[PDB]
Amino acid sequence: VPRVLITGGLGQIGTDLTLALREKFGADSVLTSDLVTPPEKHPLAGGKGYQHLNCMDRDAYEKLVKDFKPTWLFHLPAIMSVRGEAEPQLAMNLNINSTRHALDLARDYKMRCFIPSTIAAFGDKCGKVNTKDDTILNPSTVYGVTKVFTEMIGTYYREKMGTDFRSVRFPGIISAATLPGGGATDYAIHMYHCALLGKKYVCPVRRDEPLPMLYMPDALGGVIKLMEASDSCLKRAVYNISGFSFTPEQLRASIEARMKRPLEVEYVEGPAQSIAHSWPDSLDDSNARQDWGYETKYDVDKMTDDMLRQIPVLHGLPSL
Amino acid sequence: AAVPRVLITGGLGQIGTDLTLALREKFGADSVLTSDLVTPPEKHPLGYQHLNCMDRDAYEKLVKDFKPTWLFHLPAIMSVRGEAEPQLAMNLNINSTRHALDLARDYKMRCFIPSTIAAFGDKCGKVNTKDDTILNPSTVYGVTKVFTEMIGTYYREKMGTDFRSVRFPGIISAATLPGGGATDYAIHMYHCALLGKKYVCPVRRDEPLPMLYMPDALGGVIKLMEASDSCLKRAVYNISGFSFTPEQLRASIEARMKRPLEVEYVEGPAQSIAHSWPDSLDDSNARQDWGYETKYDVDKMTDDMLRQIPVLHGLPS
Ligand SMILES: NC(=O)c1ccc[n+]([C@@H]2O[C@H](COP(=O)([O-])OP(=O)(O)OC[C@H]3O[C@@H](n4cnc5c(N)ncnc54)[C@H](O)[C@@H]3O)[C@@H](O)[C@H]2O)c1
Ligand SMILES: NC(=O)c1ccc[n+]([C@@H]2O[C@H](COP(=O)([O-])OP(=O)(O)OC[C@H]3O[C@@H](n4cnc5c(N)ncnc54)[C@H](O)[C@@H]3O)[C@@H](O)[C@H]2O)c1
Ligand SMILES: [K+]
Ligand SMILES: [K+]
Would you say the CATH fold of A174-212+243-282+298-315 matches that of A4-172+215-240? Predict the structure, then answer.
């Protein structure tokens, strides 16, 4: 089995990925690291197999890599769309420089190295319907700019520096564990919570604005399957992967169908809209399907049923 | 009062040298300050100030002291060097660019940072390559220049910064020798023809590349920098001069000197890089938006180069 190091591992993806890999390869084979100490209530709090690491600190990163001798590296820290627009300097510092450190370390310590990209790599010239893997990239966010960098330098390391870098363009990832906040694609989790509370929701994304989205189990399944794939099957370094595409109105309909009662939504455009409009409406993921057998288990209604069952248990909202 | 106050960084290299001279002639010597990491060699053509653009405080100090209205940020590690020294290429080409853009934003400068055909890779559509296409550069240099284009565009769009750029072809000039490696064969071939010695060419005999003679390159950059914001529909523009292969340039030189030139093709790293680059470029946006034009065809460039190199470098006529 692999020895796995995850960095930025206390966040939305890192937490679930830590859990899934421990269950698949055993607890002792996974070390999770993060800038910050796990909060008291955090699923990974107090567990063995946690170490602090600021990925901006190259010596500290190398030290932990030499200590633990991982064979797989999941480099997850980045500043995303909304926070990046407000703190562009931080976004560039983290998204560019930590990326460089991860790649240099995967090279020299011969690790299989996953650094996720995002649909934010795309802009309004991408060809928004069934967006291809190879297209025009003109991201409108600093985040997206840094993620184009990540893709291109990672690909360069794969082609010219003998480094086993692997990546997907994630759509927005939905999870029952996440507290709704100010994120570009957070409206969906807000909708599910408001449905359960029976409260009105003010949505900042336009009512008919479609986005590619992905349910957390399908995302984790895809990452793990990509990381297990034979190099011989990987015709490219970066793959689009998709779950489904929906608009706020569509998600609302899925929720109302499941609950058999109305969800009250009011559409007031927020900062998320301008970001969302600049992203694809849907993704073409045929290359991931063909090369390495990417697939998904959840459609929208199945995600909606799962979310409405999980949220009451995980957060203590009213159950259906 | 309408005359631009110009700061050039990385100014002692191939482009900076001729750009400084062109701007002094256009606007007066007092209006241009050139700066570089290294100090001017004895026989260097070059109004000078030392500046390491990696030192952000020093860069800000010079900007605050001189108060330029135009900034030309020229330092970068180019294709061939960048393959050998990827760390340095990434440090300089990413971080010095960041410094330039932040200073151009805060001190309200019109900010030129050049890109290159090296931003393209083998998926760009090699014939008449468009401004908007797939970018898959094969060099770390090209990766850093896509970054440059994308972050500069982001600053123009969202950070109120007057960032302007062109994708330069291979630039040919008689004065300062090139630093880049890849398209340098053209200049080397002229020198060899004049010395009457055999040239060893690292690029495949029939590999076409976009090239551009320095006066057209500079005329274009200057015209872009003079353009109103209103006519600029994009931040980054392909500009083109001509497209040729090594053997076509060999023929141009031979026709002008009326004697043969010995060339031996030994395909090296430069060929792999060159083959990933466009064969020719589409510059219709630059022509449409701000009136880009050129005056030199290959024959005229050849005529100029063979007459100018001996005068500047004391080679035989
Ligand atoms: N969640 C999504 O929908 C989504 C979509 C596309 C791409 N992605 C990519 O997935 C990755 C992880 O996303 P996420 O939602 O889990 O992020 P998150 O914000 O939930 O967590 C990121 C983690 O990085 C840590 N971190 C920040 N700076 C650090 C540093 N200097 N050193 C070490 N750790 C540091 C944070 O403390 C945090 O625990 C990012 O690269 C992101 O761009 C996520
Ligand atoms: N010449 C070409 O054909 C060509 C083609 C495409 C794009 N470009 C771009 O034009 C720009 C200038 O190219 P060039 O051919 O004049 O390069 P050059 O190598 O001839 O000159 C680069 C100059 O930058 C200086 N420099 C390096 N590090 C520095 C630092 N830290 N601070 C300050 N100065 C520093 C060097 O000392 C040198 O004088 C580069 O961005 C290059 O990518 C050039
Ligand atoms: K969209
Ligand atoms: K070519």
Answer: no
Which CATH number does the domain A174-212+243-282+298-315 belong to among 2.50.20, 3.90.25, 1.10.8, 1.10.10? 3.90.25
* Domain layout of chain A by residue ranges: 4-172+215-240, 174-212+243-282+298-315
In the set B59, B107, B141, B296, the catalytic residue is B141
A284-318 burial, b for 16+ CB within 10 Å, e for fewer?
bbebbeebbebebebebeebbebbbeebeeeeeee
Tell me yes or no: is domain A4-172+215-240 CATH 3.40.50.720. yes
Interchain contact, B146 vs A135, CB within 8 Å: no
In angstroms, the separation between the Cα of residue B285 and the nearest Cα of chain A is 16
| Residue A266 main-chain phi, psi, to 5 deg | -125, 135
Alpha helix (H) residue ranges in B28-162: 56-66, 79-84, 86-90, 97-106, 140-158
Dist CA B175 CA B172 (whole Å): 9
Residues of chain B positioned with their CB less than 8 A from the CB of A152: 135-137, 143, 146-147
B237 catalytic per annotation? no
- Assess contact for B169 and B181: CB atoms under 8 A: no
Considering the domain B172-209+242-313 in this protein, what is its CATH number?
3.90.25.10
> Is B113:B73 a contact under the CB 8 Å cutoff?
yes
Q: Is B107 annotated as a binding residue?
A: no
CB B185 within 8 A of CB B270: yes
Quick one: DSSP state of residue B287? H
In chain B, DSSP finds a helix count (H) and a strand count (E) of 12, 13
Task: Look at residue B219 and give its three-state secondary structure.
Answer: helix
